């Protein structure tokens, strides 16, 4: 069963593990949400969600994000992000 090319790569670590989950949104990436985020990888309870970004300021940063419906920061259709217990 193949997949369309709207992919979006997310890798993700985890509390839980030390090597990082790889999984696919079947979004662009404009148009990722943390909703969509929080669906793909399934895990299910409180958690925090920081994500690679690059701020103009700070640089490469892991910001954190909060509400299903904020926009989630890839780069070239890959998503880096990071889950902790809440």
């Known amino acids: 069963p193949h997949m369309s090319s709207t992919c979006t790569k997310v890798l993700y670590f985890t509390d839980r593990?030390?090597?990082?989950?790889?999984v696919n949104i079947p979004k662009r990436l404009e148009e990722?949400?943390?909703?969509?985020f929080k669906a793909a990888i399934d895990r299910e309870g409180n958690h925090r969600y920081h994500?690679?970004?690059?701020?103009?300021?700070?640089?490469?940063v892991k910001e954190e994000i909060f509400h299903d419906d904020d926009?989630?920061?890839?780069?070239?259709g890959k998503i880096v992000?990071?889950?902790e217990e809440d």
Not at 17 to 22: I, V
Not at 32 to 36: E, G, N, S, Y
């Open 17 to 22: 593990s030390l090597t990082p989950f790889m």
């Open 32 to 36: 990722v949400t943390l909703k969509d």
């Open 51 to 60: 994500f690679k970004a690059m701020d103009p300021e700070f640089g490469t």
């Open 71 to 76: 926009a989630i920061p890839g780069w070239e």
């Open 81 to 83: 992000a990071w889950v």
